[PDB]
Each structure stands twice: as structure tokens, then as C-alpha cells.
Ligand binder design. Sequence first.
Ligand SMILES: N=C(N)NCCC[C@H](NC(=O)CCC(=O)O)C(=O)O
Ligand SMILES: N=C(N)NCCC[C@H](NC(=O)CCC(=O)O)C(=O)O
Ligand SMILES: N=C(N)NCCC[C@H](NC(=O)CCC(=O)O)C(=O)O
Ligand SMILES: N=C(N)NCCC[C@H](NC(=O)CCC(=O)O)C(=O)O
Ligand SMILES: [Mg+2]
Ligand SMILES: [Mg+2]
Ligand SMILES: [Mg+2]
Ligand SMILES: [Mg+2]
Lengths: 369, 369, 369, 369
Amino acid sequence: MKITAIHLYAIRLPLRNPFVISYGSYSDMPSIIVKMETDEGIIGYGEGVADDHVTGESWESTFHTLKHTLTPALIGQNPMNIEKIHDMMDNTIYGVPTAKAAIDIACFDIMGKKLNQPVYQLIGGRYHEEFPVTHVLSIADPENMAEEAASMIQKGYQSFKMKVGTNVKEDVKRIEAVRERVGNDIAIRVDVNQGWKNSANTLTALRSLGHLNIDWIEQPVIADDIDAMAHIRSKTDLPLMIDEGLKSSREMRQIIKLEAADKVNIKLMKCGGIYPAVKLAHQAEMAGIECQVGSMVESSVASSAGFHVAFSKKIITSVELTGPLKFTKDIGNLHYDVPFIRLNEKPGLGIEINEDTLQELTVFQDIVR
Amino acid sequence: MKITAIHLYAIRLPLRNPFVISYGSYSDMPSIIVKMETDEGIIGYGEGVADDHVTGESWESTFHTLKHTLTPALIGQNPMNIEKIHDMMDNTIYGVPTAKAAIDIACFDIMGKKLNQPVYQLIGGRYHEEFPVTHVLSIADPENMAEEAASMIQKGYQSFKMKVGTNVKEDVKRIEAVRERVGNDIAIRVDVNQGWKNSANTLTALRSLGHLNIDWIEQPVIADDIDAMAHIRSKTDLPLMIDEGLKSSREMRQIIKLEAADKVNIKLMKCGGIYPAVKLAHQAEMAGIECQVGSMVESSVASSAGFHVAFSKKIITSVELTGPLKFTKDIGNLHYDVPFIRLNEKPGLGIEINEDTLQELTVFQDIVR
Amino acid sequence: MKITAIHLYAIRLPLRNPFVISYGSYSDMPSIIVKMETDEGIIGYGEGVADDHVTGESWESTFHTLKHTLTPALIGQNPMNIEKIHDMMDNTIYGVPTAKAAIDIACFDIMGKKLNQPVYQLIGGRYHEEFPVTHVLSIADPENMAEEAASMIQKGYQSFKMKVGTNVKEDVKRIEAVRERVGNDIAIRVDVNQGWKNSANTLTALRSLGHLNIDWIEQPVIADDIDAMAHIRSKTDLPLMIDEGLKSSREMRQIIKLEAADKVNIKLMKCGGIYPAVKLAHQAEMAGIECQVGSMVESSVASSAGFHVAFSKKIITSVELTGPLKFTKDIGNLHYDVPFIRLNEKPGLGIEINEDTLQELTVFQDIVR
Amino acid sequence: MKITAIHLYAIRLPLRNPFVISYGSYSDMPSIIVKMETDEGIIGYGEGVADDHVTGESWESTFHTLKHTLTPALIGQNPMNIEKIHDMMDNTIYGVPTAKAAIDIACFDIMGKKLNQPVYQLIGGRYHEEFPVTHVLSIADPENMAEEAASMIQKGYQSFKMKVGTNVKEDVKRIEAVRERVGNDIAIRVDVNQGWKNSANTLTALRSLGHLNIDWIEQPVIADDIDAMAHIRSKTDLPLMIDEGLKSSREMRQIIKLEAADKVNIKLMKCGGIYPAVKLAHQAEMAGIECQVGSMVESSVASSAGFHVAFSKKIITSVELTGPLKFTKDIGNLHYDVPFIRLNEKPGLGIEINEDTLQELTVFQDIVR
Ligand SMILES: N=C(N)NCCC[C@H](NC(=O)CCC(=O)O)C(=O)O
Ligand SMILES: N=C(N)NCCC[C@H](NC(=O)CCC(=O)O)C(=O)O
Ligand SMILES: N=C(N)NCCC[C@H](NC(=O)CCC(=O)O)C(=O)O
Ligand SMILES: N=C(N)NCCC[C@H](NC(=O)CCC(=O)O)C(=O)O
Ligand SMILES: [Mg+2]
Ligand SMILES: [Mg+2]
Ligand SMILES: [Mg+2]
Ligand SMILES: [Mg+2]
């Protein structure tokens, strides 16, 4: 089996509602789709949703890094030799996890189809039967956030993720409002997306959150400040999760060494795909750090890849991949059972790509042979 | 696919020559073979060679732990759900890595045969094309050790592993003798198997080894003393490898935290098989610790499993599985190309089991259904 | 004095009521009894109750490790040369503390009978006059646990050990229920048996236990995570006890180095018997760590051995050996004075073995000469 | 069994030759002998040789501490309840290890006689068969030291302990002279008795000792400076032993925590006797610290007690009790087999006290009832 050609599609996934977080607002999500072809006729799909603010990659830079830098050396290689492919990509260029993920995912999709097995079956097998789905509430006035929450509860949701990160006073008001609205049995986690900046502001905020039964506080300080996370952890009993501060094994090593967190948000776009995501899971397990597989809000393609990793590992206890539930159009057909997610047994990523939808969402494309 | 029955065979692999190390001498190697059957008719083989001195497991205790404790709960399970199977075994009993490895290996052999792929292809794919083979010199008079080395050089060997660990003075004499005999181009590594006990004796010995061009010193102190390894590492420039001191992720975490070694000897019998061996490799990689896949001197079955792990990972740079080259009888047919080892592309472990030889070496057996 | 033969008995001690803890439920307790004979006609009894989940030993594996690995080399040795016997067993096989304890206990019983002195008199003499007895409440609905507690109070008990470890919410409810029922003068300690897994869940739970006057929280996290215990200890003022996390001196060294606990639960089955239990006590004393001698729920034989250690050391301030109070049949006759335990002055373990009961509970046996 | 009376004898043991060390010179050794009587007629002997410079105890202060402070509360107690007796002495007065040792030794002598067993048989049993005896060379001109060494070699000695500690230049000259004289096969260890004061002077001295094959350097810096020992250990590969810096478990804890030494010199006079010496051995074993049982140069009584401890523990690898070989008169009859020491099987300390010699060496005495 050899890679014969790689199609690159620069698309834009339209959102039903604006997605608003501490460092940015989104009306749609630019994504790069990879269509990997092989001499045996097997086709694999991969995806890369770049978050400029997190990995230093953009929609346009990812397309070109894939076209000119990463894909050319891949023609002729066997998609199943994943360790080798990742080594080749790493020796070619440092970082660019999102671009690498796009390739990595397509390879696993092909491997699954070739062996007629779901991807999760190839990276450890089925461990989880299902995961609850958590609805993400975009930043807004405390009353609006509480209102959408009540509205989603009627839809079956029992777990919410509150986006905050503008001003401590306001963020606290937002969290208080939602909790009062949904009662105390509804699960709530808070994501600051680096909004509180440092330990001082964070600890001040945490003082007012002790009685709100918050499952965990996600990335309250700037990504690079692992020291601050450790300091905060030494002075609070609320569980702490690192997201932007964790990308590759480089940060995991530091998080483990400094005991900087209770949980980490692993994302295929931050580490380079399925294979490296799995390595991160194994590393976290060693230190007893609870893991979650989150996302940049992606199509059914990357979302599916994320679930396949999550379902195969005991250390991964929660998932956050709801892109297919937020977009008005999707190139894939990943099935959800809100308030739950369960994976079928279809080979590879277990999804079908609607090529008519793909072309429709395509702004520009190319092929590398 | 479901496990329908597990055959257990208590055998003894005869050695051509006595194997002599610091804490024991061996005339043959007791081993437990696992024959895993499935509803689909696929058969998988696993093996467990217990080293009492390292994991607290014996030939007889492993047979019974497998028969009464581990195998019963496995009937009905899918061999491909490896993460799940390992979780079930761990929730059933703590430790007993050798017994768990026997099961783990058979599952991968089945998975490989089922998907018609070599095991290495399922855990990362092919990375290495070959590995040089290192001949192990049993403890003996310096002149005898030097003599066997010269004799093996004529056989094509270019890398040797010296077993020492009786008395510092004598061990140094042994190492000096061999080096003088083989010249300075021949690779030599030294394994003390805990013989020097502590940092004081070790450092005294290292003073006399600086000019002998030794690749690395393996486990000079007692297994449990990780602190001593770190102390020694802080006062020497000779590479240090931990073997007995490393079993599972528990020790890896400590080795990483205390910066206790440059290299680690990963063995399927110490961690519970292929799956956990891979997790250890990923953990070592995070800390930039070079890995080796060694062995307890096993048949073609476990030896093959060890190579499949080694060939799939960039972090594993050397291998030490020569049981098939030391035994006068073997139940498997793993092919070697001394001074090198290369893996074929046959499915599963890629070996055929001679059942006539298996029965011939069997002392007692049983079946669990 | 020389060991002439060792009888091994694989028995099962029937429980009056099911014993239920976080990682398992028990209807009876499998045990291995050792009958050590000497050339002088003195007979000693030892016992090994294996907990698979804690030491990696099973009922069947212990019987065989004793039969094939440990006992053969003991024939001819003097039972009183305990340091030597332990060294011989350790050089023969690593770990297997339960199997080693079985031998160790029989040797002390013989030593006591030979010198016509209680065992405690041989390891430091009498220090304690008595110890209060704590009743262990198996996991159950908060109402059932509170009910049994009230019922046992009527029986004279004034100290209780609550077994929990399913779900933080539920565990807290269980603890609140019992405390409300028994009032605030009754002593209560909580054992999670690793149920809360990590520091995050543990600290969340501890928030709700501050006003319940709990003497100490025992092993809230997984055994191997000593780091987590230290972290928890740095953020709470409730006393912390390590149980499963402590087996031999290897863990004690780490517990002391990381200041991971206030108290430790020493058990003969985890360290290899009386002699090593004493060494652990001496080690704990150096660091000012309070000690307790607990148990796996054993017959009068091992239970007695445990008390003899406890009564001879000032650092051991509490005991947890109630197997004889839980079984419907016992091969020994250890006398209790609920709510207290006091040791008589009879030689050796100070108990008589009813051989008719022994044979009755025996499933299989053998003799090594 | 109860203590009915304690005789105290203030004696002086005459030396054949002056004993000269870094901080003092001795023509004879003042010692306090204890004769413990019991209601059962069993008599036990103990001894306390005080070194003012090490424990803050003198010949006269020890006699009176025993007479007025320690012995009165002991009348009526059972000598075999050693843990209790030590607790009573510790609650009565802090420190004074030498006075406490005198009592402790007599109790064990009685326990041994009562049970008709050697003391070593009561604290672990026989482990060692023999120990080589090391001759101690008092400080003197390099030529005189080398001369006595050659003279003692003719007497069968093969191991020497060089006393130095005046001036680095001179000490180095002394060590060079002896080594040149005896050749390189003779074992030599160096004891500075705090003479080099700090790490700077010590490290300067060590530069010139690297090629002299010295087994270890004993206490080069002032006793209280454990930090200095750790610093020196971090910059040298010569084994380091702490003597004066180690008295009780308080220092052991610190030595272990700071990794300040490779070996420690345990002495009954520094820790309070046999029982606490054993606890120190157990503590050292945990950290893998090699132990030696040294002495203040005592009569056959304390010397015997020291050997009984040494012979019962694997962690104790060398002994330094040669008082009986240095005195012209001794109240005891401990048998030596230079160049070796072996213990007989006589009960208790296994020695007979010549009361005529005792009275002859007595300057003043008293009895407490
Ligand atoms: N810049 C882009 N394109 N995306 C950023 C997403 C933020 C990310 N995901 C979320 O918050 C929702 C994940 C989900 O449910 O799919 C975070 O955890 O912070
Ligand atoms: N007790 C038993 N059965 N085996 C012990 C083997 C020792 C091990 N292997 C070796 O030295 C040789 C590995 C090889 O070449 O297969 C070690 O590295 O120390
Ligand atoms: N698996 C077996 N067979 N036993 C496990 C006992 C648990 C142990 N003992 C107890 O909880 C009661 C101790 C007593 O009272 O004897 C613990 O402390 O966790
Ligand atoms: N002040 C008095 N009374 N004695 C001091 C003896 C010094 C001690 N012993 C010795 O050097 C010789 C031990 C012997 O061989 O018994 C030391 O190790 O430094
Ligand atoms: Mg986030
Ligand atoms: Mg090795
Ligand atoms: Mg417990
Ligand atoms: Mg000294």
C-alpha cells in the first residue's frame, strides 16, 4: 500500500450561532481537508482546524505547509507506517501540529478501511461504551448564558462548559447566574481561555467560586505560564485543567515535573494527530493525570478521530468534540445521541464524506502527486 | 471474535550452555506457554518466562496464577480489546507482569493473524529495518570470558554484553581481559545485575573502567535503590542503564523524576506484555531516555513479541533477545541473521509453533474454558 | 534445632457476613497455613492470607511458591536464625511478602515455644497492656452502615472504621449518616481503599468531611501514587494514613522522603512477617510517623502474630486485626475482650490449633521434607 | 523476673600503649561497670565508656547519672521488657546514651542467661560466621606509623585503621608512608576524628589520596556539620563514613535526608545500647547505608555486646571493637582469633567476669536498691 496522491481542500464550516471565547469570536470555522489516495484504491480523509492563538498556525499557512512542505515527501510511503511518517514529518518541520494532524488522521482512516476495523480498535480497542456530551456556552451576559443553559437542559443536556474570561467580577457574575438557574445537580465546568492572565487574578476569582460546585477550572492563566498553574494548584482545592498550556510532550513533561494540573485537555490539533495524542495519554497516565479529548470545533472528520482516541483509553474520562452539533453544514455524518455520544463499528473513522458538500464549502483546492 | 479456551503448558527450554549471572545460574529456562483459541478458529501463542529475582514470580506460581486467577475471566472477551483486557487483569490482580505478558502476547498474535498483519504493523508500523545482535558472555574467569569473545567474533558478532557482579576487583579484571582481547573497535556493554550493591562500590569500580570504552553500565546497584543510580549518575560520565530497577510505569515515573538513568531496559516480562511495553516506550521518549528491549532469555514466542515492539519505535535503539540462539530446542522458528536480526512480514508474531516440540518440552498442562 | 518438615494447608475461612470494600467483596477468606516441624519436636504455625489486589499474590500462587520455591531450601535451617532465613528467602525470590510471612510467623511461634516466652517478649517485650478494638463497617447504603454501627455500639464498640470508595457524593453521604447516628463521641476513621483515585477527587471529598470529626482518612488514592498522598497532605489538616501504598522498606523510604503521610498501616502480609514488620516500625519511628498494625482479615494465627508486634512497640498506637471476630470457624483460639484486646503470657503465639478444624477447612495440602 | 539491685563500679582499664587520636590522648580508659541483680538470682553485666568529646558524658557524670537518675526507677522492672525500660529512661532524661547503654547491655546479658541463648540469637540470630579484625594505628610520625603497621602485619593483621587529623600536609605524609610500607594488598581506612574541620580542607586532602587505595575516609569534618559531609560526598568518589556526626536516630534521619554518607559507624555508647543500635541498623538498611559497629575502646563486656549486634545483621559489614586487645587488664574474657573474631554460643554476652580483677580496677563503687 502506497500513497499515490493527496488532495487538499481549503473550506469553511458555517456555524449556526457565533462562537465566542475570551480571545476571539467566530462566525464560521476555516478548515483544511485532506483526501489521501492509495495505489490500492483506499481513500482516507483527514482534517486540520487551525487556531492561530494556540499553535501559531492559520487556515492559509496550514494549506501551504501541507502543499509545499509535508505532503511531497509522503507520496510513495505506506500510510500504516505511522511512527515512520511522523518521524519524517518531524524531521522536515518542527511544530505545525495542526498540519501534521490532517495527515495523521487520513492515514488512520485508511488503515481502518484496509483492515476493516474501526480506528479505536487499532489503538487499544473499545474501552468506553459512551460519553456524556457537554454543551459549550459562549461568553455573554450572565442572563443570556443562564437562559441558553435552561433552554439546552430542555434538550436533554446535563453537563455544561461555561466560557468566560473578560473581567473577574463579570465572569463570577456569569457563573453565579447560570448555577442559580440550572440548580445544583447540573454539571458545570468553567473555561477561562487564559482570560485571568495570572495566579493573583485567578485566586481572587476562585474565592467566589467555592460554593458553586464547579467540576474544574480550565486554563485560567496565559498558556506559557505553567509555573502560575502550579502556584494556583498549591493554594486551591478546585480541580485545575490545562489546555492551551499543553500541546506536545514538551509541555506534558513540564506539567508532570511541576505538578501543575489535575487534568489536561488533549487535542489532536495541538499535538499532531491520533498517534501523538495516544502518546500523550500514556504519559499522563504515568503521572495519574486525568485526560480529556477536546477540540477546536471541527467537522465530523477530526471530531470522529478525537472520539476514537477517547473511547480506547481508560485515562480519558471526558470528551469535548461538538463541532458537528454546531455547524449548519458538515462534510461528514458523525452520529450523536445527545446527551450522549457512542461510536459505531464502521471501519476507519466510520463516516461517509459527502463530496458535494465538500466542494460546496471549498474556497480553493489543489492536489499533490 | 471471542476467546473460547486457553491452553497452559509448563515447559522447560534446554540451554546449550549454562547461563551465569550475578544472582543465579541456569541450566535450562522454565517457561509457561499460552495457547489462546477463539470462536473464529484463530489461534494465538503467548509466553511467560518468570525471573523470581526480578518480579516475584516463579514457573509454578505463574502457571497457577494464569489458571485460577487470570484466564477464567478472559473467556468470552475479544482479544483485540487489549486496553480492556489489561484493565480487567489489573483489577483482578496487582503486578504479576510475567503472567499478564503471556496473555497479552497471545492476544496480539491473534490480532495480527486476524488482520493478516505483522504485530509491529499494528503498534506503529515498521520503523527499524534491522538491529545488530549482541552476544551475552556469562560470568567466568577473565581468561575464559575473553576466549569466548574471540571465538564469537569469528562467528560474526561485533557487540558483546559482559555479565559481571561478584567482586569489584575481579569484575574489573574480567572487563580488562575481554577488552584487551577483542581490541577497541568491538562494542562492549557491562551488566552487573545488582552485583555492586551501592553507589560507593559502583563509583570505585567506574574509576578503573574509564579507559575501556564501555558503551554503558547496566544496573550496578540493587533494583529498589533508584536514589543510588541518580547519585552515581551525578558523579560519572559513563552511560547508565537501569534494568531490574524498572518494571512498570511506577518506576519509570521515579526514574524520570530523579533523573536516575540514561537508558532503560524494557522487558515484556517485567511490565505485562506488548501493550504496556509500548506505554513505557512513550513515557521514556517524553524524558528523552533511550530504550532497549531486553529479555529473560525466552523462546521464539516472547522473543518475537519483543522484536515487534522494538522495530516499531524510534526511541528503542537496541535489542537483547537471544533465547532462540541459546536453546538446544525451541517451540518456535524465529529467524536470525547473526550479526543481525530482521523481522519478516508474516502475520501476528510471524512464527510457526512446532506442537510436537511443545508437547515434548511440556512437564504439565491444563485447559481453561 | 533444625526444620525437619513443613506442612502446607490450603484452607478457606468462612465469614459470618460478606466483607465488602472498594475493590472487592468476600464471602470467605482463602488462607494458607504452615505447620513447621523441628528435630526437637517443637511445632510452629504460620499463616498467609493473600490479597491479590495488594501484593500480587493469590491463594493458589502462595501455596505453590511455598511448596516449590521457599520451603525446600529451609529444611535443615534453624528457625531462630530469622535474619538468615529472611535473607535466604529474599535471595531466592523478590517480593511475595505473604508467602514469606507464613514462614516467618511459624519460626517465631517455634522460637517462643522453645524459649517458653510469648513472641512479644522476644521482640522488645511488653509495652502495651491493651488496645481498643475497632469494628469495620463494610460498604453499604448510608442507612445500613449507620444501623450496624448503632447495633455494634450496643455490643460495646466505641471505635469504627468506615469502608467507602464508590463515588465521592455517596461516600460523603455514608459518612454523614453514620456520624449523625452515633453522636460525636464515637471514634470514626475512614478507609477508601484507593476508591477516590487521585488528589483532586480526594480534596473535593475532604471539603465535606471537616466538620465530622474523622480521626483519619486511609489510602484515598491508588497505591502507587505516593506523590498524590504528599500533595493531598499539603492541602488538608485531616490526618492521612497510607495502607496499600506501603508494603516494604522501599515505600517507607519514599513516604518518609516525600512526607506523604501522618500514619501508616503496617501488615505482616505486605512486608513478609514479624521480623520485617518490626524493621518497618523502627523506620517509621525515625521519621515520627505513627504506626498501626492492620490485617487482611486473618485467622487467630496471623492475627496473633500481628498483636505480638503491636504490643511490643510504642510507635504502634492502634491495631486492626479482627478476623477471629468475623469468621464462623477459626483454626486458632485467640481470646478477645471486646471492646478491648489483651495478650496472655502463653509461649509463642500463645494459641492452640484445633487440628480437627484445620483439616475440616482444608481443600488441599502437601508436605515438604 | 525483677531487678532487685544494681551495683555501680567506677573503674579504669589500663592501656598497654597510649591511644592517640585527633582530639585527645589516652593512657587508660575510665569505664563504669553495671552489675544488675534479679529476684531469680540471674546476674547481668553492662558497661559505659564515656567519650566527653562525643556525647557530652564523662566518667564521673555517668556514674552519678546512673546512681541518682536512671537506676532508681529500674528497681522492680523486668529486664526483658527492653522497649519499656528504654522508654522509661528516655522519659526520665534526654540523651546520656553511654549511661543508658550500661543498663541496656546488662539487661540483654540477663535475658540471654535466662533463656540460655547468646544475645545475638535474641536479636535476629546468627548471620555472620566471623569478621576480620582491624588494627588501629594511633597518630604518630609517618615513619613510626608505617613501622608499627609492618610489625602488626607479622602478627597476622591484614586490615588497618589510620588515625590522623593534625595538619593536612602531615596527615597525607602519614598515609603515604604507611601505604608504601605495607604494599597495595593491605586494607587501609583513614579516621580523621573531625581533624580536617570543613569540606575545603577535606577536599584538598582527598586530592592527594586518590592513588592510595583507601577503603574509606571517616569523619573528616566537625561532628555537627552534616551539610559539609554531603557537600564533600558530592565532589569525591572515595567512600565516606560518619562517626561522631551520628549518635541517635535524629542524626540518621538527617544523614539519610541529605545523602551525607556511604557508611556510618554505629556505637552502643552513642545511641544507648543494643536495642537502639539495632534500630539504627534497620534505619540504615532502608537507605542502603552500609554499617559498622565501632567502639570507644571498651572492656570485654561492652565489646561483646557490640559483636552480638554486628553478627546478627547483614547490613553491618565491619566491626571495630578491639579494647580487649589493647588493655593490659580486662574484667572480661572475650576470645579473639586475630586476624579474626568469632562469637561462641555461650548464653548472654557469653563471657565470665573476673570479680577479683573488677575490684582491683575499681576506684569507687555503690549499690542502688
Ligand atoms: N479557534 C478555533 N477554531 N477554535 C477554538 C476552540 C476552543 C476550544 N474548544 C471548545 O471550547 C469547544 C470544543 C467542542 O465542544 O468541540 C477550547 O476548549 O478552548
Ligand atoms: N532468570 C531468567 N530466566 N533470566 C534472566 C535473564 C537476565 C537478563 N537477560 C540477559 O542478560 C540476556 C537477554 C537476551 O540476550 O535474551 C538481563 O538483562 O539481566
Ligand atoms: N483481600 C483480603 N483478604 N483482605 C483485605 C482486607 C482489607 C484491609 N483490612 C480491613 O479493613 C480489616 C482489618 C481487620 O480488622 O482485621 C484494609 O485495611 O484495607
Ligand atoms: N574517648 C574514648 N574513650 N574513646 C574514643 C575512641 C575513638 C573511636 N574508636 C577507635 O578508633 C577504636 C575502636 C576499636 O577498635 O575498639 C573512633 O572510631 O574514633
Ligand atoms: Mg479549552
Ligand atoms: Mg540486565
Ligand atoms: Mg486499609
Ligand atoms: Mg571513628
